[PDB]
Design an enzyme around this catalytic site. Structure first.
Site, PDB file in Angstrom:
ATOM      1  CD  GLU A 131      -5.677   2.482  -6.809  1.00 29.88           C
ATOM      2  OE1 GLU A 131      -6.089   1.504  -6.261  1.00 29.88           O
ATOM      3  OE2 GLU A 131      -5.660   3.515  -6.123  1.00 29.88           O
ATOM      4  NE  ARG A 152       2.294   0.832   3.581  1.00 25.91           N
ATOM      5  CZ  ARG A 152       3.392  -0.127   3.660  1.00 25.91           C
ATOM      6  NH1 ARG A 152       3.641  -0.687   4.923  1.00 25.91           N
ATOM      7  NH2 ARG A 152       4.266   0.126   2.719  1.00 25.91           N
ATOM      8  CD1 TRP A 197      -6.866   9.614  -1.984  1.00 16.86           C
ATOM      9  CD2 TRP A 197      -8.127   9.505  -0.145  1.00 16.86           C
ATOM     10  NE1 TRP A 197      -6.084   9.899  -1.045  1.00 16.86           N
ATOM     11  CE2 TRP A 197      -6.734  10.212   0.219  1.00 16.86           C
ATOM     12  CE3 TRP A 197      -9.043   9.556   1.113  1.00 16.86           C
ATOM     13  CZ2 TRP A 197      -6.351  10.489   1.392  1.00 16.86           C
ATOM     14  CZ3 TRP A 197      -8.577  10.063   2.187  1.00 16.86           C
ATOM     15  CH2 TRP A 197      -7.251  10.535   2.632  1.00 16.86           C
ATOM     16  CB  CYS A 202      -1.269  -0.045   1.137  1.00 20.37           C
ATOM     17  SG  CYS A 202      -1.943   1.726   1.098  1.00 20.37           S
TER      18      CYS A 202
HETATM   19  C1  HEM Z   1      -6.428   6.845   1.558  1.00 17.66           C
HETATM   20  C2  HEM Z   1      -6.288   6.550   0.245  1.00 17.66           C
HETATM   21  C3  HEM Z   1      -5.664   5.360  -0.366  1.00 17.66           C
HETATM   22  C4  HEM Z   1      -4.888   5.314  -1.556  1.00 17.66           C
HETATM   23  C5  HEM Z   1      -4.339   6.392  -2.657  1.00 17.66           C
HETATM   24  C6  HEM Z   1      -4.394   4.003  -1.528  1.00 17.66           C
HETATM   25  C7  HEM Z   1      -3.411   3.428  -2.471  1.00 17.66           C
HETATM   26  C8  HEM Z   1      -3.468   2.023  -2.765  1.00 17.66           C
HETATM   27  C9  HEM Z   1      -2.935   1.419  -4.305  1.00 17.66           C
HETATM   28  C10 HEM Z   1      -2.442   2.385  -5.453  1.00 17.66           C
HETATM   29  C11 HEM Z   1      -2.729  -0.133  -4.189  1.00 17.66           C
HETATM   30  C12 HEM Z   1      -2.300  -1.037  -5.160  1.00 17.66           C
HETATM   31  C13 HEM Z   1      -4.030  -1.357  -5.674  1.00 17.66           C
HETATM   32  C14 HEM Z   1      -3.786  -2.338  -6.867  1.00 17.66           C
HETATM   33  O1  HEM Z   1      -2.978  -2.382  -7.744  1.00 17.66           O
HETATM   34  O2  HEM Z   1      -4.897  -3.078  -6.636  1.00 17.66           O
HETATM   35  C15 HEM Z   1      -3.101  -0.056  -2.617  1.00 17.66           C
HETATM   36  C16 HEM Z   1      -3.160  -1.609  -2.022  1.00 17.66           C
HETATM   37  C17 HEM Z   1      -3.331  -1.972  -0.967  1.00 17.66           C
HETATM   38  N1  HEM Z   1      -3.997  -0.852   0.228  1.00 17.66           N
HETATM   39 FE1  HEM Z   1      -4.094   0.866  -0.063  1.00 17.66          FE
HETATM   40  N2  HEM Z   1      -4.722   2.847  -0.523  1.00 17.66           N
HETATM   41  C18 HEM Z   1      -5.362   4.025   0.153  1.00 17.66           C
HETATM   42  C19 HEM Z   1      -6.100   3.483   1.360  1.00 17.66           C
HETATM   43  C20 HEM Z   1      -6.070   2.238   2.095  1.00 17.66           C
HETATM   44  C21 HEM Z   1      -6.966   1.832   3.406  1.00 17.66           C
HETATM   45  C22 HEM Z   1      -7.938   2.787   3.816  1.00 17.66           C
HETATM   46  C23 HEM Z   1      -6.714   0.395   3.644  1.00 17.66           C
HETATM   47  C24 HEM Z   1      -7.012  -0.537   4.576  1.00 17.66           C
HETATM   48  C25 HEM Z   1      -7.273   0.136   5.766  1.00 17.66           C
HETATM   49  C26 HEM Z   1      -5.491   0.137   2.444  1.00 17.66           C
HETATM   50  C27 HEM Z   1      -4.780  -1.221   2.492  1.00 17.66           C
HETATM   51  C28 HEM Z   1      -4.135  -1.615   1.151  1.00 17.66           C
HETATM   52  C29 HEM Z   1      -4.226  -3.306   0.798  1.00 17.66           C
HETATM   53  C30 HEM Z   1      -4.367  -4.407   2.007  1.00 17.66           C
HETATM   54  C31 HEM Z   1      -3.698  -3.341  -0.240  1.00 17.66           C
HETATM   55  C32 HEM Z   1      -3.163  -4.685  -1.080  1.00 17.66           C
HETATM   56  C33 HEM Z   1      -4.238  -5.111  -1.990  1.00 17.66           C
HETATM   57  C34 HEM Z   1      -3.983  -6.365  -2.826  1.00 17.66           C
HETATM   58  O3  HEM Z   1      -2.943  -6.861  -2.215  1.00 17.66           O
HETATM   59  O4  HEM Z   1      -4.587  -6.413  -3.560  1.00 17.66           O
HETATM   60  N3  HEM Z   1      -5.551   1.037   1.419  1.00 17.66           N
HETATM   61  N4  HEM Z   1      -3.532   0.674  -2.172  1.00 17.66           N
HETATM   62  C1  LIG Z   2      -5.599  -6.268  -8.889  1.00 17.14           C
HETATM   63  N1  LIG Z   2      -4.916  -4.879  -9.152  1.00 17.14           N
HETATM   64  C2  LIG Z   2      -5.046  -4.232 -10.374  1.00 17.14           C
HETATM   65  C3  LIG Z   2      -6.667  -3.873 -10.291  1.00 17.14           C
HETATM   66  N2  LIG Z   2      -6.843  -2.459  -9.485  1.00 17.14           N
HETATM   67  C4  LIG Z   2      -6.134  -1.295  -9.852  1.00 17.14           C
HETATM   68  C5  LIG Z   2      -7.686  -2.953  -8.511  1.00 17.14           C
HETATM   69  C6  LIG Z   2      -8.505  -3.924  -8.354  1.00 17.14           C
HETATM   70  C7  LIG Z   2      -9.119  -4.163  -7.199  1.00 17.14           C
HETATM   71  C8  LIG Z   2      -9.975  -5.085  -6.918  1.00 17.14           C
HETATM   72  N3  LIG Z   2     -10.876  -5.960  -7.034  1.00 17.14           N
HETATM   73  C9  LIG Z   2      -9.479  -3.045  -6.309  1.00 17.14           C
HETATM   74  C10 LIG Z   2      -8.746  -2.094  -6.224  1.00 17.14           C
HETATM   75  C11 LIG Z   2      -8.563  -0.809  -5.270  1.00 17.14           C
HETATM   76  C12 LIG Z   2      -7.382  -0.910  -4.299  1.00 17.14           C
HETATM   77  C13 LIG Z   2      -7.390   0.436  -3.326  1.00 17.14           C
HETATM   78  C14 LIG Z   2      -8.006   0.240  -2.271  1.00 17.14           C
HETATM   79  C15 LIG Z   2      -7.977   1.413  -1.253  1.00 17.14           C
HETATM   80  C16 LIG Z   2      -8.590   1.262   0.130  1.00 17.14           C
HETATM   81  C17 LIG Z   2      -7.426   2.704  -2.030  1.00 17.14           C
HETATM   82  C18 LIG Z   2      -6.974   2.665  -3.113  1.00 17.14           C
HETATM   83  N4  LIG Z   2      -6.622   3.799  -3.691  1.00 17.14           N
HETATM   84  N5  LIG Z   2      -6.965   1.244  -4.054  1.00 17.14           N
HETATM   85  C19 LIG Z   2      -7.689  -1.748  -7.638  1.00 17.14           C
END
Ligand code: HEM
Ligand SMILES: CNCCN(C)c1cc(C#N)cc(CCc2cc(C)cc(N)n2)c1
Ligand code: HEM
Ligand SMILES: CNCCN(C)c1cc(C#N)cc(CCc2cc(C)cc(N)n2)c1
Ligand SMILES: C[C@H](O)[C@H](O)[C@H]1CNc2nc(N)[nH]c(=O)c2N1
Ligand SMILES: C[C@H](O)[C@H](O)[C@H]1CNc2nc(N)[nH]c(=O)c2N1
Ligand SMILES: [Zn+2]
Lengths: 407, 411
Positions: B285, B111, B280, B108
């Site tokens: 993404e 963070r 957000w 993430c």
């Molecule tokens: C506040 C705004 C936030 C932004 C801009 C942000 C940004 C991101 C981005 C760009 C990714 C990669 C997503 C993907 O490619 O699928 C990500 C992954 C992640 N985020 Fe954050 N995030 C935010 C808030 C949070 C919150 C509130 C949580 C949980 C409380 C969180 C927990 C995670 C987790 C667990 C992943 C890994 C998801 C996975 O492995 O598929 N994020 N986040």
């Molecule tokens: C699997 N990764 C690539 C596709 N993307 C961008 C993608 C797939 C899924 C699902 N389901 C969900 C997301 C959102 C991840 C996320 C979560 C939070 C809390 C904030 C944020 N900015 N992005 C992103």
């Protein structure tokens, strides 16, 4: 123990068995992944020789033959007696090609079997090294139709007689700090540039001065040589749409030629083994031109494009980046100098991985280095799982000689 | 033991000691790095140490380590484990737990915000209807008319593994995908299989390119039930470009609320199998991944056509050109409609400041470089140049298998 890798764009799953023949360590443990870290005796030598000769005789379908056994025997006798051994030309060529085949950080490896190997093990002086290197440079350049090559100087002996090219690449640009506080030319080479000065090079003190070779033969103090300018093919950078681009006065060299690595074959160490291929466009246009600690030209280009440099969210850096990279490709192509774009190279690498999985049982690949420094996810390598592990023969990092050498 | 990371752009070197507190495995060994691999019921036995480790962490964080309050709580949890074979978290421990799972989330980039997370405790929930209500409230609160607020809603923990609460959707808001008889896809190709399940369960599909999916909600190990999120609660942004007036006629929109609903939250050995969380978006993404992956909306071609780029050779970098414009468009649209979004330059710069702060105050910041570096313009962001260490701390968010693969159907 048998491992799977999946492509998330195509669902293609490959099974890796080649990793079980892995030898050196990764830096990682079950507790910590070091995947993004840039740099993580007679007894010892014969197992290394045997493992190598075994893979060699296997490759020529002669495993367990008299000639296989006889060579193992002969190398064993030579180590016992001399403390080292000499490779046959056939083994040398095989070893160097396989060091490239095993290079997990190299996207260009579809080409690995077409490598011209220049055996320079008869070299004894720095003038000799200069001669070998000029010949390599001219052969590889080939008037813009680039050909991959490696030149292999004598192997390490007692370690007080190392051959070294002090330059990081055969062809690179000078870097100078000024009273101004800023940097003229390439900031990556400031230290090396001053080592050349403190050794006696007359620097023209300009933005794109081809550095002299600093060559070390047989553990002696290194000596300076200017590569004949007629052998250094350079490319003026213009843009197919922006006429002003040329006025930035940018140029780059056609030949990418890494010269500070160590080639390990069958336990033998080749500390001077310069090798070259041809560029992927992003190396110059993204890294050389746009890294903040390099030529760092984004700001100037964005200005000439009159983009909104007020807020990062206009993506002005991103826009300029693409244009700069279009220009590099266009310039090399216009001047008939071999170059590959990141789309083409990464597609070739996927096809290579598939060949290697199919024919060899795998392909060690370092995702952090393989995915291009721009437009990552629109290249197929981004979606391809890769396993990284170390096979030998290999190219390894070694310390810069100015810290090691005793003058 | 100390471990150093170097930034190759600044030569700043950081020292990690936090990795010493790492427990779970990475998937790597001294012989293989699995750094690019996407996916690499408990007994009293294993539960009490996990509870103890968690409560020691919680109590140190409040500067009450070894206090009577600390000790009584350990004994109370201990007794509860030996008696009921599990235990209940106090509200305060749940909040700390959920905030820390985010803090520990190495994939993430967002963070820097970890300590501002609104935690909704939904552990009194018993039915799918109850879950729908909690999720509506979460969506309304987090959306906040475009001024997005981070939130998590936490349903009851796993018991015997037969009574699991699960949100079947992978995100709270996502668009349907439909595979046509000719082999083309309408809408989002990522959600075809899920869309088909919804259809089988009785969802009436509008069959357009941007149909918001129903929620498919499983309470207490029961068969899941369908619910439609009120449309007035689903904030969406029509996508337009500041300079290209034809961009709007591509018919693109996206939803404003990114909300992950398929992960498992582990706190002190307890497993929260339904814990939808939201923040957000970072622009890429949507603009890079959702729009431009070949296996997603895949709009690069149609965009590049309309820009009249040279599409005959990849070396024109037409894809790279269309890619940038699309991403400009996404950010422009969100900003214009006053919906929270962050660009990849801002987000990565903030991440580096967060990561440095974490090294100083915490002794480390586990980070997965493969995920942290943005999927366009990688090396012109500061994270590309930052060496990272990836390791697993608890509390944590974990993957879990899709519930249609494991659920025992009741009928
Ligand atoms: C506040 C705004 C936030 C932004 C801009 C942000 C940004 C991101 C981005 C760009 C990714 C990669 C997503 C993907 O490619 O699928 C990500 C992954 C992640 N985020 Fe954050 N995030 C935010 C808030 C949070 C919150 C509130 C949580 C949980 C409380 C969180 C927990 C995670 C987790 C667990 C992943 C890994 C998801 C996975 O492995 O598929 N994020 N986040
Ligand atoms: C699997 N990764 C690539 C596709 N993307 C961008 C993608 C797939 C899924 C699902 N389901 C969900 C997301 C959102 C991840 C996320 C979560 C939070 C809390 C904030 C944020 N900015 N992005 C992103
Ligand atoms: C044929 C054209 C070639 C292309 C397009 C190519 C592509 C690349 C690229 C893009 C990198 C990353 C470089 C960086 O970011 O610094 C790389 C690294 C590497 N390449 Fe290749 N390559 C080619 C030929 C070769 C040859 C001929 C060899 C050896 C004989 C080789 C061995 C390596 C090694 C060892 C690295 C890693 C060097 C390091 O860690 O800094 N390459 N190559
Ligand atoms: C350290 N990597 C980032 C900077 N770049 C792009 C960079 C720096 C140095 C040096 N010294 C050298 C290179 C060349 C790597 C290389 C080698 C070969 C044989 C072919 C090729 N296309 N690139 C690339
Ligand atoms: C810290 C990080 O490992 C470092 O910036 C790496 C990332 N990936 C790279 N990839 C390539 N091809 N070349 C590089 O120099 C780097 N640098
Ligand atoms: C194989 C590879 O790990 C996979 O494509 C990853 C790469 N990096 C990523 N990074 C983010 N943020 N999200 C992703 O889905 C992925 N996918
Ligand atoms: Zn690893």
């Amino acid at each position: 123990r048998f491992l799977k890798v999946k492509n998330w764009e195509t669902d293609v799953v490959l099974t890796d068995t080649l990793h079980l023949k892995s030898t050196l360590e990764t830096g990682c443990t079950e507790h910590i992944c070091m995947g993004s870290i840039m740099l993580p005796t007679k007894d010892q030598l014969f197992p290394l020789a045997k493992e190598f000769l075994d893979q060699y005789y296997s490759s020529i379908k002669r495993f367990g033959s008299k000639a296989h056994m006889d060579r193992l025997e002969e190398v064993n006798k030579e180590i016992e007696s001399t403390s080292t051994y000499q490779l046959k030309d056939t083994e040398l060529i095989y070893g160097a090609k396989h060091a490239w085949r095993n290079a997990s950080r190299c996207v260009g490896r579809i080409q690995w079997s077409k490598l011209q190997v220049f055996d320079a093990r008869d070299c004894t002086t720095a003038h000799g090294m200069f001669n070998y290197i000029c010949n390599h440079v001219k052969y590889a350049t080939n008037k813009g139709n680039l050909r991959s090559a490696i030149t292999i100087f004598p192997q390490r002996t007692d370690g007080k007689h190392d051959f070294r090219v002090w330059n990081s690449q055969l062809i690179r640009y000078a870097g100078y700090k000024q009273p101004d506080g800023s940097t003229l030319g390439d900031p990556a080479n400031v230290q090396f540039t001053e080592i050349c000065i403190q050794q006696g090079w007359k620097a023209p003190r300009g933005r794109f001065d081809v550095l002299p070779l600093l060559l070390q033969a047989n553990g002696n103090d290194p000596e300076l040589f200017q590569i004949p300018p007629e052998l250094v093919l350079e490319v003026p950078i213009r843009h197919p749409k922006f006429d002003w681009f040329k006025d930035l006065g940018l140029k780059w060299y056609g030949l990418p030629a890494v010269s500070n690595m160590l080639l390990e074959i069958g336990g033998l160490e080749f500390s001077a083994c310069p090798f070259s291929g041809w560029y992927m466009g992003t190396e110059i246009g993204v890294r050389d031109y746009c890294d903040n600690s390099r030529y760092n030209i984004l700001e100037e280009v964005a200005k000439k494009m009159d983009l909104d440099m007020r807020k990062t969210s206009s993506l002005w850096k991103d826009q300029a980046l693409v244009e700069i990279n279009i220009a590099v490709l266009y310039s090399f192509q216009s001047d008939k100098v071999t170059i590959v774009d990141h789309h083409s190279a990464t597609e070739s690498f996927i096809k290579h991985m598939e060949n290697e999985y199919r024919c060899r049982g795998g392909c060690p690949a370092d995702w952090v280095w393989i995915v291009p420094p721009m437009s990552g996810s629109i290249t197929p390598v981004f979606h391809q799982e890769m396993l990284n592990y170390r096979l030998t023969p290999s190219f390894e990092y070694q310390p810069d000689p100015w810290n090691t050498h005793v003058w």
